[PDB]
Structures are given as structure tokens and as C-alpha cells.
């Protein structure tokens, strides 16, 4: 019910489902972006996952316990987006991040474009550790997209 892995986040009412995002189950905690769930509870099979920690400024939320993903981009190496697009199987895409330069420091950023419901897909280092989640970013002049590598703090 909380087995480790990457998951789709779906919504359904009376008709079919829609994939609104993706997230990571690790160490019994589900990790996704705030804009995917708006910080609301999730169903997993017969069970309920309750929000535990989150921050709208970071655009992150964890379920069942505190944020567990602590790996950091090394600022140097290529990474992989494990993209889980709506209606498509999970695929690994390797890229060298660029940089979001902010007044509070630099953040790695990936220039990869996927549908909105791919939000929350994990970005990985060469050891397979999740160094952040995809989907909070900017649209540049030509209409293409750059996502921050958004990572929480493991307290």
C-alpha cells in the first residue's frame, strides 16, 4: 500500500480518471508537489494517506511522515528525469541541468517539457537517489520549459 516506487496521482468523479501528477514513495512517506494535490488527502487502494508536512513556497508536500528525500544534485553531473507522463509508461531521460540563479542561491534546473500531469516525477542521480521533483518552473521566450530540481529538507 506504501511500497517504495513511483506512483501516478489520479482524480476521478463520475466518468473517467485524469492524471494530475506523480510522486515518490520512500520510507513509508509519499512525496509530491503541492500543486498536484493542493495538500489534500490521498487514497492508496483501501487506505488513506494524510498530509504531514508541506510548504507552498517550495511547492512540496509529504504524506504519512516528514520529507525523506535528502539527496542533492552535485552541481556538476548529468541527471535523469524518470518521467511518468499521463497515459505513457515511465521513461528515463538523461540531461545536464542548467541553473536557476536566485537571490538566495542557485538551483539546478532541467530543460525538459512534459504535460502538466507529469508534475512530481522524480529526478535521479547516478545512484538512483531522488535529488528532486519535476514540475515547478518557467516558460522561456520560445515557449519551451525549464523545471527547477525541487528538493525538500530532510530534517
Amino acid at each position: 500500500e506504501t511500497t517504495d516506487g513511483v506512483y501516478r496521482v489520479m482524480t476521478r468523479r463520475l466518468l473517467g480518471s485524469t492524471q494530475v501528477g506523480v510522486g515518490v514513495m520512500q520510507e513509508g512517506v509519499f512525496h509530491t508537489m503541492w500543486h498536484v494535490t493542493k495538500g489534500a488527502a490521498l487514497r492508496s487502494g483501501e487506505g488513506r494517506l494524510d498530509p504531514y508536512w508541506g510548504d507552498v513556497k517550495q511547492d512540496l508536500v509529504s504524506y504519512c511522515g516528514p520529507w525523506k528525500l535528502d539527496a542533492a544534485w552535485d552541481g556538476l553531473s548529468e541527471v535523469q528525469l524518470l518521467a511518468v507522463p499521463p497515459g505513457e509508461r515511465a521513461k528515463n531521460i538523461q540531461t545536464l541541468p542548467g541553473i536557476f540563479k536566485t537571490k538566495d542561491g542557485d538551483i539546478g534546473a532541467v530543460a525538459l517539457d512534459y504535460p502538466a500531469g507529469t508534475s512530481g516525477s522524480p529526478i535521479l542521480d547516478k545512484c538512483g537517489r531522488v535529488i528532486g521533483l519535476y514540475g515547478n518552473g518557467v516558460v522561456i521566450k520560445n515557449g519551451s520549459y525549464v523545471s527547477a530540481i525541487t528538493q525538500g529538507k530532510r530534517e
Binding site: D4, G5, R13, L49, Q80, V84, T102, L124, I140
Partner: protein, 39 residues
Amino acid sequence: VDMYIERAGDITWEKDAEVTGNSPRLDVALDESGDFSLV
């Protein structure tokens, strides 16, 4: 509204992967509601 999760795979680095995308160097600001914007 039923918001629910479904497993979609294992989290593994793929050896010999497709490398793509550029590496843009952008000046951005982040507001208190989580929006990034270009400066």
C-alpha cells in the same frame, strides 16, 4: 472527489540513456506562493 495513487514503476537509473536538452542559465525569482518567474 476521489484523488488516489497507482504504482507506476521502480525508481532506477537507466544505463546508456538518451541525453537531451540544453543547460540554460536563467535569472529567476521565487514568490511566497511557489511561483518562479523570469527576471
